[model samples]
Target chain A: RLVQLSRHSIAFPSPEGALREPNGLLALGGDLSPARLLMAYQRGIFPWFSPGDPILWWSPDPRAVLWPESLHISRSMKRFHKRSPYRVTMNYAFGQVIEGCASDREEGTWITRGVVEAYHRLHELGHAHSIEVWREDELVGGMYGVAQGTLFCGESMFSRMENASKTALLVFCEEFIGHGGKLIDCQVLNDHTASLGACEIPRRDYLNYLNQMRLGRLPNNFWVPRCLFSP
Target chain B: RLVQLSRHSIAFPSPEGALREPNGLLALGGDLSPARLLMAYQRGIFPWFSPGDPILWWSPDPRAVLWPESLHISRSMKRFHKRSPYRVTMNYAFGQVIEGCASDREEGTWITRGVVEAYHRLHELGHAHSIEVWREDELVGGMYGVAQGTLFCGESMFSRMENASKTALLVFCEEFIGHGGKLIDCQVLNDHTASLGACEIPRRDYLNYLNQMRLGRLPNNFWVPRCLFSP
Candidate 1:
């Protein structure tokens, strides 16, 4: 049975109690309050919902996470990355990046106004960060996520030009991994993420990694992006 | 039946289907993305959850709301208000005000870290606001809420001194009502709010008021404060 929440409570049932059939339908009916979101992140939980839906919290058993060091660019994508005309910047055009991500959702966008607003708030508070990919003066692709210690919980990315988002992910992982960042929480499995070397590990193991990272200090300039063309 | 939300969906169930046993337990399981929160507010729903619990959304049928013109400061509190030595301000110390509200929760604080952080984001975005009551330079009492059009959805408040919170509320109502603000959504009813002239109106009526206010443009200086002592 799913746990019903009280408005006056912020505690979540253990992830172990999450439903198996749903993959990880944990507790339902919570606000996307910052404290709750942060706590959810810290406890290996996160909110994922679409417009018009009540808030949903989850902690999937086989968490899909990418170790920055393990990011794999296919030969063609590597060549594309090498010749990519996109210039990358951090914290520039965050609202735009989110808008881009929401614009091309074939399955219909879940990046509702509330999601955009909440993450924007997170960005302002220095918890959420973004990387923008620009082709000349126009933004082409970018991604955004919450950063807790060494973990980068990626939310979404969008590309205007072909391979633009791939480029953003490639550069983001390079910089983050170079700066001692450990994990990129993809949240759930997707073929695209899988192609980029994201892998699933037991939820317990993911939590262990999160705890380990939480105990360490974040790297300097963790939010700063390195040169996309840098050697 | 509770809805199990996926990361891509944002539709909530009809409020009429919400559980009556819990007062107003609506659909569960969704993220707290800004888009979602704004949608909730637009529909006259809001989030309320304590720490260690999943987030909860509510739209109590007999919605608790207060009209500024209907504020009833008891004769005694009116006398106290006349002689009150406290100074009031707006958005002067948001983080502090939330901390103050969370400091002395006898039944414990629903203003969890997530709630605080979420509102902080809202405040930064110019959507959420706070009213601070002070004795000298120290904060004595305060309240905070999300502003949608002219409606202010109060989250919570606290007082460090007797009547301090009431003073904050009175000043808040006076200023808000004075500026053409129409409704203050107390969310749920309690004796204290009722004593201050808050009354329960039908949820349908409350939604109508919200929809009407939403159609008008927000005032230019909505976030700016008026001097309570300026006669």
Candidate 2:
């Protein structure tokens, strides 16, 4: 059923016996407001509308996700770690991260300027954040997305140097797992995301977990500058 | 032989057969300069040095690469693109792109803080750039790296929205091939990269091609903002 999404609220279909497809199209017609987006994602539904099309929502089967503690580390990667090639920081450059994501070219980019402005608003409101990967004074790789309680819903990431983004994820997971982060919401599945240990669960289970999980309970401080070992 | 990398000049074995095992320690002791890095990459050799480790270099037997014109676009991708879900851009948010690449962590992140600064400096010098993907006013996906003559060296990419990164790649290839760009330097082989038309080339042939190709011939500013035709 078509629904309207707005700053304060969002509407989505109840998970029924919808045939499991690529990513289940369970609903359509939603707003792009931060509150609405956050609410929708929390309910195991996400918006994936195109530029000209009505806002579309999907709930794919076998949802790709990452358990904070389940990430894989190769020997080479371990060996590469001694020098701390890139400094890993969080929320240091939220604006820059999103801008980079929005400006990338290949095909469809849903991170419209509207989205950027909205997310920036969310960041100011303390509901959104970013993870920054850096070298010296320059920002390198990282990701940005919404945050609710222990769940960090990832939106996008880019890399200018080798494995910069991958490293961001690694550091994110390390800190997330350390701080009791239960899940890293990947929203969809891809070979790259899968290689980094994203997996799937039933939509019902996802929503159920969301219901049990407390929203907006975690600290809003950016995950950086301070020692990583300090809580 | 082990040596120290100096300013603007890094040395390597001329024969290209000096690497060791999978680590591919082809050469060591080169300075972290643009000329050295560019020369090394052109010959399929890459620096993998860490902070404490001597400047390590490698030129594995098989070099992973993608020929832009030969990318495979799935049926779904085609269907998705019929509406032109989002607009695509190039060479935008280059700094942010590299920052994203350098920031994240999964286990091993080779993009150190120093490296991030270096790449950003490279971008400032006009040797590095980014391909941006946009949806309306937002950025959804993109990739960044160095370009020399008709060759593009891809560093990394990130996608926040659905199929955003894929779309960016498709557009990049269309534009690359259309503009006489040849050979995408993938640096390494991975399942995700392989799925996107990347293949391995024997080191010797790759080196021969690299040697034949001229660098610094094309003006740094030589770029097209948008594809001449639909990708």
Question: Candidate 2: global Cα-lDDT?
Answer: 0.65
Off by over 4 Å in 2: A1-9, A17-19, A219-231, B1-231
**TM-score between model 2 and native:** 0.47
Docking model 1 quality class: incorrect
lDDT of 1 by residue, A1-231 (tens): 687665555557888888887888898786665544555777788877777888777899899999888888788988887777778888877888888887877622677777788777667545678888888889888888887667888888887799888888888887777777788999898887798789999999998988777545444344543454432
Worst-scoring 10-residue span by lDDT in model 2 chain A: A222-231
Q: A113 in model 2: Cα distance from truth in Å?
A: 1.9
Model 1, DockQ value? 0.02
User: For model 2, how does the per-residue alpha-carbon lDDT over B164-204 read when each residue is reduced to its tens digit?
Assistant: 77888887787677656777877778887898989998877
Of candidate 1 chain A, the 10-residue stretch with the lowest lDDT total is A222-231
Q: What is the lDDT of residue B84 in candidate 1?
A: 82
User: Model 1 segments beyond 4 Å from truth?
Assistant: A224-231, B1-231
TM-score of each: 0.52, 0.47
Q: On a 0 to 100 scale, what is the lDDT of residue B96 in model 2? A: 62
